Write a protein that binds this DNA or RNA. Structure first.
Lengths: 101, 200, 92, 83, 91, 97, 79, 108, 92
DNA sequence: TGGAGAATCCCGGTGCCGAGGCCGCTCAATTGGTCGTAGACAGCTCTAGCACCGCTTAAACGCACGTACGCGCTGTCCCCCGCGTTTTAACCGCCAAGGGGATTACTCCCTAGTCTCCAGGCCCGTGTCAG
DNA sequence: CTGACACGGCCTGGAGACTAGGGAGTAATCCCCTTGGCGGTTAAAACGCGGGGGACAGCGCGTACGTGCGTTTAAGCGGTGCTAGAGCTGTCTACGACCAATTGAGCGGCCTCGGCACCGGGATTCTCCA
């Protein structure tokens, strides 16, 4: 056999594209799953996780801490309009609320 | 007796210990009065404080890594997971070490066939240092044991060799690709082989 | 002055992330409610903590909507009619 | 073995703490009983759904998954417990 | 049990190297990844059944992302997925 | 002549437009509104007539529910006249932005 | 500018269906903005469903799927 | 062979058991579908259809009509509390609203 | 061809109201209702089977999906009617 | 309270078009048998859930006082309702012409299935740092 | 000053490679449904105007929450002990997928006639002023 290069590294991603392919297969979503669908879904999930972690790291840096706690995740989600639109119906445990009077 | 190697045999630097710990018999002395007669097929060598993959990199002076300033050839075990151990011998100089990797036995196959259990091919019978260290039943309580005293395990004299680079220490630093790991040629029981370093 | 301690309590209870209801009365309330649906139930600790997190977030959001209803009628005191108006508009 | 009215365990300072987290400057005296009733309704719905999820799996222990799936049903997803 | 913990480690080290993360925050991000994956895959299943196909391609995932995600998030997620699919098919 | 008091004609209209099931917005202006909104997304686009009827029924139902919540918001503030702050309150409680 | 086609008596009639007795003069512009936002949200999803199927026209099932996507399920147009 | 008896006819159901089986199998719900699940689901859908249809017929009788129109279905759903709770996010086309004027708007 | 739940809703209507007809728009609304409730119950049963690591939808999954979806009295009567139908299916 | 303008319902005829019944048939549901595996069933281990005791100790509770605030009352003035009149364009019907949805044949590429192998990721009890 | 988190064998699920068959892409055609314009009748909107009436501001009072302090209490933490049952594994059986032949049930088409919208006159309230 040839060199076993991982399919996640072929797309330049970090998320487990093979795991997304398997979870799409056994999740009973369609009879067959195309080749680029796990790549696209892993890239989209990686981008959304990266944006959440961007704003969470900035929130942790603004409060002078070097470790992301769920309060930072709540401020990161709710301080952006788009992520608050995506996670409007979602409660983050140990997340707190924003200061408004 | 005469078939025992003392502390004066190990008084060489790191790379002669890498050269002179190949093809020699390690006879573990179990309390039942039997023998094992295992021949080692590969070793590893850490030069000391100047090696990035060693445990004493950058002047590390942890109380567990202390067995080098009283005698050379000191037995050492470290926990690696959470139950596994490894076989280490201190070389000459502070921080220099040689790690045992794999051996092959010739008698008492049932002993580590049934003792290693907590699928049973001869190639994977003694491949991996942790389960063979468990097969010799050397725990963390034998870290203070000196190598060539009492009735315990010693070295026995036996009757090509290809050098390969470091594998599994990460793709960083300058000491992660030096060819010093010696393995015998033509042996099919070697766990990690180098197909590009065989042609030299 | 009447109101400044309330304002500092508002300011200090929004920066904190801790759980505002005591744990054991909530645990006993959950076991009392669950008795009517099934007899002799066991509960995990994470189940009761998940229930407390959901209940506290639900009550905080309901009190935000209640405060908007109270400020809408030109007063700063929340009343049960504000809760009922917000609760009907949210669909409950 | 039989638990009484433990709805009074959600005390008055707890409701005041939750309202001051919400941003409420003044609280009426009849707010508290309405809050007991609202909490009772919410816990009744979520606990009933989680107990249904529990007895479908033939278990006597209500798991964090049962409450998480109940809240995912009721339109309010709870992150942090393995959902 | 499988989780996305090491992948969120890798993303966080790419985006914020002097920043750690707790266990509770990683549980929240694992639940977030599972939730977004379930939303996008369920929408792709719905558009597969609506058009009488039995295949989830990149087009259904692209349209599901464009339906679910809000505006600038949708634009950048479509750009990222398109770059990933073109790079993966280029080799 | 005869002139009705303010409130009689409004309640007559409330009973008239709650007894009926008809559509209230004129169909052609709603069609033109749907066309100019859809031309901001994809140009040269056609529509089924049943699609515009579906959009009109959904929009009318949404506006009737919004005006009911607005009416309760105005009744809550000791008023009978609804104002834009009532609509803004109802949409803020409902979760719309 | 076809938003003025949603006339003031139409907004008054929709408020009459909602049981509203008195209406301020500034209600109509806010109602036009609300209706425009709602129609943009539904029509964008319907156009997206149309473009996925590679068609030039928006059907009733596309609008029904777009409204079911937002939790505003519509009966009587097929399903 | 034997006489062909319908699966709906042997469970006393008017709703089709086999069609519900085929819609479950092609619906991508699970890989396998048991025998009793289409029978159970057909009975449940038959009961809910009967519950709306009886109330809609009563509403059609109350408005001196022989046919059932969308207004009768909307009145039947919105006047029963369980069906209004079940269909709370459902817009019936040509349905109208319930006649409901508040007490503070009526004259004295 | 297009399949519909038209004749079955008509049969139920003639069974419960033997002198009452139905319009085309009303039949479209009832067909959409049957499709919506069927999709709701089957989606809930699929989620329940995936949560408990079961690859089949049995009568039990539909029973607990009906109990989760429908409000109380409707849920009780629907579970009783389904149990009666499955019992009549197995015994004959 | 009465009278009168005005809105609303009832009964009688009409004519219309959409529901409701019948029929040919094509497609999907039934019947019978086989075969492979998902899942019921019995049993065991060990996690963890419940029950009980006691000490600090913070939080809940009861009470006293005062003042901020809800709430009713009154004046007033803008602002919307109701109605008549004029302008404006929605709407019904029709022709037509063109785009485009929907169906069909085909031929092709891509994705499921499977066999083998190996490398990433999980499990885990001590080194070292950030609240 | 310490506890949560990171840096250290083996195993199983991803990956390469071959096969093959059917699902989706493409070209072509048929006709149903969309658009657009015109006439023309008219329902419906736009606009102006008067006036009632309701929103809104000011003010006074009475009471009911906030705030503070002392006494009570039971949460919270630590620890122990017992056992229900959660979770896993092994075995085997019956239950559902799958396939081929059969056949009748529902669907498209078509004909027909009876419920329902509509017009209209008279009875019956609705409302507003006097």
């Amino acid at each position: 056999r040839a060199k076993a290069k991982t399919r996640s590294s072929r797309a330049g991603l970090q998320f487990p594209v093979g795991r997304v392919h398997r979870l799409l297969r056994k999740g009973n979503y369609a009879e067959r799953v195309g080749a680029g669908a796990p790549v696209y879904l892993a890239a989209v999930l990686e981008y959304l996780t990266a944006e959440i972690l961007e704003l969470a790291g900035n929130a942790a840096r603004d409060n002078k801490k070097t470790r992301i706690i769920p309060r930072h995740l709540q401020l990161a989600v709710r301080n952006d309009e788009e992520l608050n639109k995506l996670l409007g119906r979602v409660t983050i445990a140990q997340g707190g609320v924003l200061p408004n009077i | 007796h005469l078939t025992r190697l003392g502390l004066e045999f190990f008084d060489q630097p790191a790379v002669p210990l890498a050269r002179a710990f190949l093809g020699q018999v390690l006879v573990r002395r179990l309390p039942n009065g039997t023998e094992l007669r295992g021949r080692i097929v590969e070793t590893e060598a850490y030069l000391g404080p100047e090696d990035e993959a060693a445990h004493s990199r950058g002047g590390r002076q942890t109380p567990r890594n202390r067995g080098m300033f009283m005698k050379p050839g000191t037995l050492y075990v470290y926990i690696i997971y959470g139950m596994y151990f490894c076989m280490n011998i201190s070389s000459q100089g502070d921080g220099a070490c040689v790690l045992l990797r794999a051996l092959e036995p010739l008698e008492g196959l049932e002993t580590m066939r049934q003792l290693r259990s907590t699928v049973l091919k001869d190639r994977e019978l003694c491949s991996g240092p942790s389960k063979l260290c468990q097969a010799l039943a050397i725990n963390k309580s034998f870290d203070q044991r000196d190598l060539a005293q009492d009735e315990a395990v010693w070295l026995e004299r036996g009757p090509a060799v290809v050098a390969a680079a470091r594998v599994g220490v990460g793709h960083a630093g300058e000491w992660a690709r030096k060819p010093l790991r010696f393995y015998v040629r033509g042996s099919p029981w070697v766990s990690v082989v180098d197909r590009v370093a065989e042609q030299d | 002055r009447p109101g400044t301690v309330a304002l500092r309590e508002i300011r200090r209870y929004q920066k904190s992330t801790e759980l505002l209801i005591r744990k054991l009365p909530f645990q006993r309330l959950v076991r009392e409610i669950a008795q009517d649906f099934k007899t002799d139930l066991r509960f995990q600790s994470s189940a009761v903590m998940a229930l407390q997190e959901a209940s506290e977030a639900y009550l905080v959001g309901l009190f935000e909507d209640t405060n908007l209803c109270a400020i809408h009628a030109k007063r700063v005191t929340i009343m049960p009619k504000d809760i009922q108006l917000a609760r009907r508009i949210r669909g409950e | 073995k039989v638990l009484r009215d433990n709805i009074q365990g959600i005390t008055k300072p707890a409701i005041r703490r939750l309202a001051r987290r919400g941003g409420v400057k003044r609280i009426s005296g009849l707010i508290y009983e309405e809050t007991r009733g609202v909490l009772k309704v919410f816990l009744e719905n979520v606990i009933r759904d989680a107990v249904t999820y529990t007895e479908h799996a033939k278990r006597k222990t209500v798991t964090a998954m049962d409450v998480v799936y109940a809240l995912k049903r009721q339109g309010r997803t709870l992150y942090g417990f393995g959902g | 049990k499988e989780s996305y913990a090491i992948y969120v480690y890798k993303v966080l080290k790419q985006v914020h190297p002097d920043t750690g993360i707790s266990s509770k925050a990683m549980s929240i991000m694992n639940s977030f990844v599972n939730d977004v994956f379930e939303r996008i895959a369920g929408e792709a299943s719905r558009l597969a059944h609506y058009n009488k196909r039995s295949t989830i391609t990149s087009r259904e995932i692209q349209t599901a992302v464009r339906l679910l995600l809000p505006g600038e998030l949708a634009k950048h997620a479509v750009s990222e997925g398109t770059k990933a699919v073109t790079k993966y098919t280029s080799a």
